[PDB]
Nucleic acid binder design. Structure first.
Ligand SMILES: [Zn+2]
Lengths: 171, 88, 252
DNA sequence: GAAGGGGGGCTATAAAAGGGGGTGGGGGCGCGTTCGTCCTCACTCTCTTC
DNA sequence: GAAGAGAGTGAGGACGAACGCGCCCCCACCCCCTTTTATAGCCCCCCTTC
């Protein structure tokens, strides 16, 4: 690919390199060597340097060179708990379980270790959304209580009748 | 002379002969497939999965896995959701 | 239920439609019998798939002009096979073609696998594969075909006289009885017998002509004809009028 | 050029492997009609006006 | 004492959202591919004789 195919292989090669465990940054020219992109266009060399390698959220500019961003990705149980806490504190929202799994290898160990601290919501497509378990105010009760509560239909009542009950019972 | 008994229809055997001669598509190495996918990206911005299979000439399951590794699919309200070769 | 006659077989009556105590006369039930009718005097995928196969079965039948009763029998086989679901992988057209073949065999009018193939997009090999599977699934069996099960269709399709058809049937039956063609397919024996009978009458059909209707390559007819040719006088019926003498029958 | 013969192939029969290809059943998904929603207009009373 | 715009009401016409009606697609599920073997018949293609 011209102006589009080369960058894809750079990202793929960089991702694979990190999986090996090489946190050391790599130069633009060095990465091009192992990606068989030595003949890349000059205008793409500056374009990747100025735009592709900085705008992407997985590229870290260290001492001029570029390195992966495992810090942003969750790679520890503590980071997993912290990320959810910030989401609840700032009200950012939940995160799909698949997103955590790819970012966190063996995410099952972290998820099970935290246990109830993570709230799981099952989407129609089996996707699980993780939410922080705010343990400030908790209230869990027996199942039949909700069943009786559900038995008390309220959507099929008017405001006048609902408010009339208050004076009917004397409260 | 109509519907004369025949072991197999002439069209059916000819089609089978063509398929047998052509053979099933093989699983090319990821590097070669990736290079072909990237090279074809220049011609047009977006490709259809069925059409892309013909261009790459690879098994659908293998191609989808390779495409999923980098490529993504964008929902379009005009015809349907189609695969986009751009990873980003 | 005569109050006087506990457990009495009440007799039905068509005069007013009531049941009467057989030995009391009492009418139990005023006019309850309903004499007139009593006596003669958004589609599910499974159903849609069945409906298409039913349409395919009829389409196949008309091509070879099969009676509706065989088509009705074929539909029952398809429902049994479709319900049992041992052929879920196999295409419905292939199942229907095998069901049509089985229905013909069950009714005593077999059609050769080639004949069913000619009216179906499914090849003979696939029909045979489905044919065996259906028998296992239905736990049923089909009587072994005989050379005479195809003489009427083959001879009539060849426009051969009735005497020739009887002579061919006698030749084919006798040849199998004499074991002159051990292991040969009944169709091949019938085709050879038709050729032997045809050449002995005014109406003479070439080997290619007999092969086309019977679906048997002339080489196979030639092989079978060579096996029965030596015993030609014995196979022919005694009261057969030879337009061409048996001694002068074609040799090949 | 017609016909016979030789050589070759097709089919079933088990079993196993791994993977491509064909197919039925859903599932989101755009396009040709249909009814409700929105808009338009004739015929008079009304407060106001003269 | 004698009369204009405007609006309620009656009443007619055009366009959008929803309901289908399927076109297309994606996803399980199965069968096919291959090789080995002996067997027998049937069938097709090529060579040979006349
Ligand atoms: Zn009685």
């Amino acid at each position: 690919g011209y102006k589009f195919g080369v960058l894809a292989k750079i990202v793929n090669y960089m991702k694979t390199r990190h999986q090996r465990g090489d946190t050391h940054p790599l130069t633009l020219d060095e990465i091009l060597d192992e990606t068989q992109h030595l003949d890349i266009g000059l205008k793409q060399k500056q374009w990747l340097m100025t735009e592709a390698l900085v705008n992407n959220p997985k590229i870290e500019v260290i001492d001029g060179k570029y390195a992966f961003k495992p810090k942003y990705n969750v790679r520890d149980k503590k980071a997993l708990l912290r990320l959810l806490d910030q989401h609840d504190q700032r009200g950012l929202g939940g995160i799909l379980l698949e997103d955590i799994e790819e970012a966190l290898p063996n995410s099952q160990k972290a998820v099970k270790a935290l246990g109830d601290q993570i709230l799981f919501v099952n989407r129609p497509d089996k996707k699980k959304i993780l939410f922080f378990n705010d343990k400030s105010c908790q209230f869990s009760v027996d199942e039949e209580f909700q069943k009786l509560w559900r038995s008390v239909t309220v959507d099929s009542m008017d405001e006048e009748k609902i408010e009339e009950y208050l004076k009917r019972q004397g409260i | 002379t109509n519907y004369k008994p025949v072991a197999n229809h002439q069209y059916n055997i000819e089609y089978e002969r063509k398929k047998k001669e052509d053979g099933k598509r093989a699983r090319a190495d990821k590097q070669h497939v990736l290079d072909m996918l990237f090279s074809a990206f220049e011609k047009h911005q977006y490709y259809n999965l069925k059409d892309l299979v013909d261009i790459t000439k690879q098994p659908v399951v293998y191609l989808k896995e390779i495409l999923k590794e980098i490529g993504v699919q964008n929902v379009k309200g005009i015809h349907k959701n189609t695969w986009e070769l751009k990873p980003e | 239920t005569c109050p006087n006659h506990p457990d009495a077989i009440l007799v039905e009556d068509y005069r007013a439609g009531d049941m009467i105590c057989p030995e009391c006369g009492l009418v139990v039930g005023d006019r309850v019998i309903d004499v007139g009718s009593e006596w003669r005097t958004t589609m599910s995928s499974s159903d849609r798939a069945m409906m298409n196969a039913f349409k395919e079965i009829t389409t196949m039948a008309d091509r070879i002009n099969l009676p509706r009763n065989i088509v009705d029998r074929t539909n029952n086989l398809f429902k049994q096979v479709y319900e049992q679901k041992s052929l879920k992988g196999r295409a419905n057209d292939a199942i229907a073609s095998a069901c049509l073949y089985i229905a013909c065999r069950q009714e005593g009018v077999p059609r050769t696998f080639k004949e069913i193939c000619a009216v179906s997009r499914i090849s003979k090999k696939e029909i045979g594969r489905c044919f065996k599977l259906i028998l296992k699934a239905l736990e049923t069996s089909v009587d072994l075909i005989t050379t005479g099960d195809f003489m009427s269709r083959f001879c009539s399709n060849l426009c051969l006289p009735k005497q020739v058809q009887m002579a061919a049937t006698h030749i084919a039956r006798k040849a199998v009885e004499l074991d002159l063609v051990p292991g040969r397919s009944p169709i091949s024996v019938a085709a050879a017998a038709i050729y032997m009978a045809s050449q002995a009458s005014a109406e003479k059909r070439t080997q290619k002509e007999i092969g086309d209707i019977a679906g048997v390559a002339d080489v196979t007819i030639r092989q079978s004809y060579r096996l029965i040719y030596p015993r030609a006088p014995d196979l022919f019926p005694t009261d057969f009028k030879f337009d061409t003498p048996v001694d002068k029958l074609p040799q090949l």
